[PDB]
């Protein structure tokens, strides 16, 4: 639980190809600012459907 | 013993110049020395009046000895000049050779002080101001004329009258080095890199003492550690009373010098080893730093023993990021046999290991007063050996005092000594040192060792010493005078002649 944002932004760079414009330490939760993760919804249904 | 011994040791590895030296000592340094003491006391004359009484066509020795004792003293005094120039630069709390000076644009050090040690930009550019080649000689460099004048003035102020004025200076300046040397030994053996140098001194590279070069060097050094064939000891042993036990003195002197010859090698290598192990730790720390700065490891995980495994533990994790760092290479037994030469052994090694100890503005002054009062005596004897045969030649009208002749010799040698104070000055000194210390000494020694036992008769000399001291000499002296000494000499001679051709003549 002390690498959450490290891994979030590593994955973002490596597989999406998107870099953050300001460095974000471990006091943030950038994924939790999404409607689906803050309201407890499964997200894989948008992949398989496509 | 401090300025030519360790260099002539390191060039020949370091272990192959202690067995031949001692064999040649016990076989040639003692018997010839006893012989020349005994003659000096029997014939009752100086270094020239003797070889002019034995078959008078042999007066040449009285001139070869004088000429060679002049050629040696020509530069054995400018060495004292450099030493006292160093001695003057002490008496300041930050030692001048401990930092690099900045250029006109105060951003970094001067070039050659950065690419080399900070102490080499005090000996090669501020003291001497060496030029690139021997064929290139420039100004006169006044700030060494000052030291030359001071050296040739101290000498003339001490030997104004031969004996009756070297007495007191011998009382003082022949006991001082034997306590400062012990003070430096006690400090040397407790350093960090001791027992790593003095063990390097005694490991003989067996396939090295089978070369004529090392034998020739030991042979030419055992006659220069003493002062045989200089014509100085004949005259000194031509003053005391007749019924004096000429043997005892000879033997004790022979065993008080050959002992202080391995007692100075120990102290010098106890500092060379320290400097080498210091540079080795510095290289290793630099490698460790270049690794961690490159891979971001914690501080105390790469230490001197798990280094190789930790270096293997990174190359298997970042193969493209690893093959860019320029690593060094450094192993001991390769930092010991480095570029160390005379005129640069007691000024480049001892002066950088003297600034890494507390209260250095005291250790430096002690060391250089030791060197000065160790080198002054020798010049006392040499000046006696050049002054005695001159007035025994009727060259000056006998009505003039002795002070005038000593002063004339001093002035003449000083005025000739302008050749070493030029820019390209260290090269002339290296050349004269090498050749005038190597070749004429052993030929004069052999010629006299032959003349005494085969032109004066050995039996006459035998019963002569018998009447003098009170007993025929033991069989040892007989066998070492009659066959072994001249035979060894011939060998050394031929080796010198076989070590001159087929060896290129190069200087640095």
């Amino acid at each position: 639980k002390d690498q959450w944002m490290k891994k979030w932004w590593e994955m973002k760079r490596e597989i999406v190809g998107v870099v953050e414009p300001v460095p974000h330490d471990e006091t943030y939760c950038d994924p939790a600012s999404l409607f689906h993760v803050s309201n407890d919804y499964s997200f894989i249904r948008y992949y398989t459907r496509t | 013993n401090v300025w030519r011994f360790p260099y002539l040791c390191q060039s020949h590895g370091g272990g192959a110049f202690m067995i031949p030296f001692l064999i040649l000592l016990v076989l040639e340094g003692i018997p010839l020395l006893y012989l020349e003491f005994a003659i000096g006391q029997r014939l009752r004359r100086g270094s020239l009046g003797v070889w002019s009484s034995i078959h008078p066509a042999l007066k040449g020795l009285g001139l070869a000895s004088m000429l060679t004792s002049f050629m040696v003293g020509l530069y054995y005094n400018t060495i004292i000049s450099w030493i006292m120039w160093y001695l003057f630069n002490s008496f300041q709390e930050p030692l001048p050779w401990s930092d690099c000076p900045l250029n006109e644009n105060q951003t970094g050090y001067v070039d050659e002080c950065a690419r080399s040690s900070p102490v080499d930009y005090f000996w090669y550019r501020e003291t001497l101001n060496i030029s690139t080649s021997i064929s290139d000689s420039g100004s006169i460099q006044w700030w060494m004329l000052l030291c030359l004048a001071c050296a040739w003035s101290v000498l003339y102020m001490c030997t104004i009258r031969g004996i009756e004025t070297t007495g007191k200076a011998v009382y003082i300046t022949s006991t001082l080095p034997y306590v400062v040397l012990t003070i430096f030994l006690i400090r040397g053996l407790t350093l960090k890199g001791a027992t790593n140098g003095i063990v390097f001194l005694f490991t003989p590279n067996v396939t090295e003492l089978a070369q004529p070069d090392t034998w020739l060097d030991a042979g030419a050094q055992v006659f220069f550690s003493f002062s045989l064939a200089f014509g100085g000891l004949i005259s000194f042993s031509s003053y005391n009373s007749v019924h004096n036990n000429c043997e005892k003195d000879s033997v004790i002197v022979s065993i008080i010098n050959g002992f202080t010859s391995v007692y100075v090698a120990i102290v010098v290598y106890s500092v060379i080893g320290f400097r080498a192990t210091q540079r080795y730790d510095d290289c290793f720390s630099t490698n460790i730093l270049t690794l961690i700065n490159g891979f971001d490891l914690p501080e105390g995980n790469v230490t001197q023993e798990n280094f190789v495994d930790m270096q293997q533990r990174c190359n298997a994790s970042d193969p493209a990021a690893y093959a860019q760092l320029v690593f060094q290479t450094c192993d001991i037994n390769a930092f010991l046999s480095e570029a160390v030469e005379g005129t640069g052994l007691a000024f480049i090694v001892f002066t950088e290991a003297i600034t890494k100890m507390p209260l250095s503005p005291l250790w430096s002054v002690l060391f250089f007063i030791m060197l000065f009062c160790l080198g002054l005596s020798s010049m006392f004897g040499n000046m006696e050996g050049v002054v005695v045969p001159l007035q025994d030649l009727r060259v000056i009208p006998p009505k003039w005092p002795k002070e005038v002749l000593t002063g004339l010799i001093c002035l003449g040698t000083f005025l000739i000594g302008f050749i070493f104070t030029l820019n390209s000055g260290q090269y002339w000194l290296s050349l004269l040192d090498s050749y005038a210390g190597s070749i004429p000494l052993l030929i004069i020694a052999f010629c006299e060792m032959f003349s005494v036992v085969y032109v004066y008769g050995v039996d006459r000399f035998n019963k002569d010493i018998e009447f003098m001291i009170g007993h025929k000499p033991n069989i040892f002296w007989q066998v070492t005078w009659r066959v072994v000494s001249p035979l060894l000499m011939l060998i050394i001679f031929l080796f010198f002649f076989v070590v001159e051709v087929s060896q290129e003549l190069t200087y640095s």
Partner: protein, 149 residues
């Protein structure tokens, strides 16, 4: 920035937790506040939350940059941060007990200090006193003889 604690302190080396990062960010904010008051005569209230830090590592290294107080899109150019640090480096060192070779700033290298020691070239007066004593010895000993004759 690259920090080396075991080299300088050797022992007594404190541990670099997060409160040290707090103190470091505050020191940099102070240095910036000082520079924009003694050069440009502004009065800007940098805080420790205007000093952004990235890529922390065990070796004790990282990167940082500075932004204007409440404007995330206003980065102070690097050639000004370098001057502010050049100006307050000696206090930033003291706050941590580091000594300018264990707190390197990687592109800011130190130079301050003049090498003008010698006023007199002290070897000259030592040569003078030795020359005086040697000449006085020479004359007294050449006059001893003429007195004894």
């Amino acid at each position: 920035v690259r920090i080396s604690l075991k080299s300088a302190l050797g022992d007594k080396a404190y541990e670099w937790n997060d409160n040290e990062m707090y103190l470091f960010r505050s020191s940099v904010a102070y240095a910036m506040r000082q520079y924009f008051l003694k050069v440009k005569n502004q009065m800007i209230l940098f805080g420790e939350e205007d000093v952004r830090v990235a890529n922390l590592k065990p070796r004790i290294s990282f990167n940082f940059f500075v932004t204007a107080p409440k404007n995330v899109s206003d980065i102070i150019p690097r050639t000004e941060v370098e001057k502010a640090i050049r100006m307050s480096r000696s206090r930033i060192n003291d706050a941590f007990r580091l000594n300018d070779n264990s707190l390197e700033f990687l592109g800011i290298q130190p130079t301050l200090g003049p090498p003008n020691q010698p006023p007199v070239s002290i070897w000259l007066i030592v040569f003078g006193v030795v020359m005086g004593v040697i000449v006085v010895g020479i004359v007294i000993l050449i006059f001893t003889g003429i007195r004894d004759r």
